[PDB]
Design a protein around this ligand. Structure first.
Ligand SMILES: [Zn+2]
Ligand SMILES: [Zn+2]
Lengths: 115, 98, 44, 49, 304, 69, 49
RNA sequence: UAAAUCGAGAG
């Protein structure tokens, strides 16, 4: 089963106000445990096993100057299949803000599956 | 603790008893049950799996007297071992002739 | 290099604050590359 | 144990629980089929504790 | 007064053929229970070697890594199970694998396009280099002290022509595989047998003589190697029932409705055992009976 | 997608008879049954594992994101 | 035997490896979406603009 | 964290 969730950090700004959230690990202090899945760009390593509650992206925020990480909101543990760093077609060098993460989950036939 | 005696199914003197063995299935149960039913002192013998998912096997041995059902189980196991020995020897000796 | 253009397949990289764009062609979609890391499995 | 719709009172009975070790589905004996008017082509039902 | 000596007196082993990939023999004058026990222990309880833990370092192929690792696990290994001990799941995974119980395989295959591919040809062999990943690519990497004992026997798959995956230029597959010893009831990949099954010897009873052209028709209702004809009177007889699958096509005819009866012998088992490749079928059978004897002995030694 | 390593029912390894079956159907003019038999597939369980395979991975391999189209 | 279909192998695997360059095989599949394509292509093109 | 409306389904 392939499932795609779109992680977006541009949800909380408009009218050209500055980007307050930057993908990646900031200069503050964070526990290194988050390095299991996230890359130095705050993106999941492709093909990693993602449980529930494990981080799937890290964004250093200007509003608080503390590194905040998003989690996986699902029950079935998944594998990070692919990532699309969607860019915006604007003349400005607008930073990366929209990401499309697609995961695969192994649906081995369990008892109770309709055939 | 591979095999246990079910005190709630047995008899006082031992002339009838039930055994529960882990990690076994029809494969050992049927062989042992046939072999022990070949013993003349045993009245009622049978095998039962509580639930297929569980790896448990109960063997019911009710003798006719004169020998405790524990000993009947031991003799059945011995005769199973001897049967395996003879089939091994026969197959080995006949594989060389070919 | 950790990214790949979704159009011309040419590998590329991204700087901090830098625009999300393929250098060699007009594309702004960048797949994340797969790097060398341990991933375990079980053949079941 | 109840199985919607509850067309009659006998469709919401009380069973004794056996803790099976293996799979994620409510395993139920055949006799109660007419009692719940159930099948096993994906019928869903609820257990209240 | 059934006794082991009496069984030994009646029991005997006949063989039809032999091979390293298929043994067809007979066990005669033995109870259905023991034939079933041998069949089942052969299918399930014989230890074998197959890929268990598949560590991945990179997989850019089109196959999702779980399916690839499962294919590797399904790959039979031409290694005798007897050479290595068993694993201890309760110990830490750091020291769970040792040189005595874990066999380490690798696979580092990267696809690169071949410039010398002739123009106007669609063959993936000429176009690409290392396009197809095969089982022979599963290079064996001995570890620890097993560089000596495995030198005589190279750990190679029983089938090196198994097509694991298909690559394309740019893509690559690199992995290691700890393969260990396990029984086929745990998982079918650990099974050592393609199929090990018996059948009751067919028995044909020609109740009445069917002499004449009818016998010609009656012979046609069975495979070639079973029914023959007498010389003087054209009367049919059974030659070798082992060459008759039970089709029951004779009963389809009203003419021979009450002239033949078909059944099975009570204790005449024809075993056909096809090995996976790690061991000979005969060694499979012997290991099965030996494990049954050991099982009964261990059970006997259990203090109830 | 790609040829299964083993036949599901029995367990016989049919993970190597795919290209051979294609060759015996293509290099030599053979019917499907003749090719399956000449590879050692008499049980219909093993025969259906190679007879009806589609080998979809070829169509999956065109869409390579690591090579300029 | 008369009701003889055939696995079009060596015709299907070949078409898998190298897709057609001339016209899509299975014309019946294109006509399945005639109501949509043939209708959207009726608002711009055709007679009267 | 919601709640509605439209659509798709399971029994
Ligand atoms: Zn590009
Ligand atoms: Zn098969």
């Amino acid at each position: 089963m392939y499932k795609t969730e779109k992680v977006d950090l541009a949800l909380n700004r408009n009218r050209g106000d500055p980007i307050t959230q930057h993908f990646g690990f900031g200069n503050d202090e964070w526990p290194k445990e988050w390095l299991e899945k996230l890359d130095e760009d705050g993106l999941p390593y492709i093909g990693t096993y993602v449980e529930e509650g494990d981080p799937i992206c890290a964004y250093f925020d200007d509003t608080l100057n503390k590194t905040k990480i998003k989690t996986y909101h699902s029950s079935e543990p998944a594998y990070i299949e692919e990532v699309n760093l969607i860019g915006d077609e604007s003349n400005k060098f607008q930073e990366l803000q929209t990401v499309s993460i697609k995961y695969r989950i192994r649906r081995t036939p369990q008892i109770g599956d309709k055939f | 603790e591979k095999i246990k005696l079910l005190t709630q199914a047995t008899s006082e003197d031992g002339t009838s008893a039930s055994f529960q063995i882990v990690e076994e299935d029809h494969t050992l149960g049927n062989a042992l049950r046939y072999v022990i039913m070949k013993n003349p002192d045993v009245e009622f013998c049978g095998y039962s799996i509580p639930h297929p998912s569980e790896n448990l096997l109960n063997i019911r041995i009710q003798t006719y007297g004169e020998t405790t059902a524990v000993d009947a189980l031991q003799k059945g196991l011995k005769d199973l071992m001897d049967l395996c020995d003879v089939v091994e020897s026969k197959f080995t000796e006949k594989i060389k002739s070919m | 290099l950790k990214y790949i253009c979704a159009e011309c397949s040419s590998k590329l990289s991204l700087s901090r604050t830098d625009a999300v764009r393929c250098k060699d062609c007009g594309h702004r979609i960048l797949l994340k590359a797969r790097t060398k890391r341990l991933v375990q499995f079980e053949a079941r | 144990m109840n199985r919607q719709p509850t067309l009659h009172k006998a469709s919401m009975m009380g069973h004794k629980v056996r803790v099976l070790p293996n799979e994620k589905t409510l395993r139920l004996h055949y006799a109660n089929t007419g009692a719940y008017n159930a099948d096993f082509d994906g019928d869903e039902m609820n257990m209240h504790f | 007064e059934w006794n082991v000596e009496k069984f030994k007196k009646d029991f005997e082993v006949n063989i039809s053929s032999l091979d390293a990939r298929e043994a067809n023999f007979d066990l005669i004058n033995i109870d259905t229970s023991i034939a079933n026990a041998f069949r089942r222990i052969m299918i399930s309880e014989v230890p074998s070697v197959a890929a268990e833990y598949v560590y991945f370092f990179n997989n850019t192929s089109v196959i999702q890594d779980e399916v690839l690792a499962h294919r590797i696990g399904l790959v039979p290994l031409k290694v005798d199970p007897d050479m290595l001990t068993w694993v201890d799941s309760n110990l830490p995974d750091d020291e769970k694998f040792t040189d005595e119980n874990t066999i380490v395989l690798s696979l580092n295959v990267k696809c690169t396009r071949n410039p010398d591919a002739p123009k106007g040809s669609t063959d993936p062999k000429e176009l690409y280099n290392n396009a197809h990943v095969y089982a022979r690519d599963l290079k064996f990497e001995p570890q620890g002290r097993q560089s000596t004992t495995f030198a005589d026997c190279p750990v190679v798959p029983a089938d090196p022509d198994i097509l694991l995956a298909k690559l394309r230029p740019g893509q690559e597959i690199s992995l290691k595989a700890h393969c260990i010893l396990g029984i086929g009831g745990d998982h079918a990949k650990f099974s050592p047998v393609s199929t090990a099954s018996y059948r009751l010897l067919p028995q044909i009873n020609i109740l009445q003589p069917i002499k004449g052209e009818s016998a010609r028709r009656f012979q046609k209702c069975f495979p070639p190697g079973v029914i023959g004809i007498d010389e003087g009177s054209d009367e049919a007889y059974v030659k070798d029932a082992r060459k008759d699958t039970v089709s029951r096509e004779v009963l389809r005819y009203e003419e021979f409705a009450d002239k033949v009866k078909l059944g099975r012998v009570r204790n005449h088992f024809i075993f056909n055992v096809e090995s996976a490749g790690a061991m000979t079928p005969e060694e499979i059978f012997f290991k099965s009976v030996r494990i049954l004897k050991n099982k009964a002995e261990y059970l006997k030694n259990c203090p109830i | 997608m790609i040829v299964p390593v083993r036949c599901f029912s029995c367990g016989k390894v049919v993970g190597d008879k795919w290209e051979s079956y294609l060759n015996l159907l293509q290099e030599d003019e053979l019917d499907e049954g003749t090719a399956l038999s000449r590879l050692g597939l008499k049980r219909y369980c093993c025969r259906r594992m190679i007879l009806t395979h589609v080998d979809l991975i070829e169509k999956f391999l065109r869409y390579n994101p690591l090579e300029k189209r | 035997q008369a009701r003889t279909a055939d696995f079009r192998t060596l015709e299907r695997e070949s078409r898998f490896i190298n897709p057609p360059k001339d016209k899509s095989a299975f014309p019946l599949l294109q006509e399945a979406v005639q109501p949509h394509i043939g209708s959207f292509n009726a608002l711009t093109e055709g007679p009267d603009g």
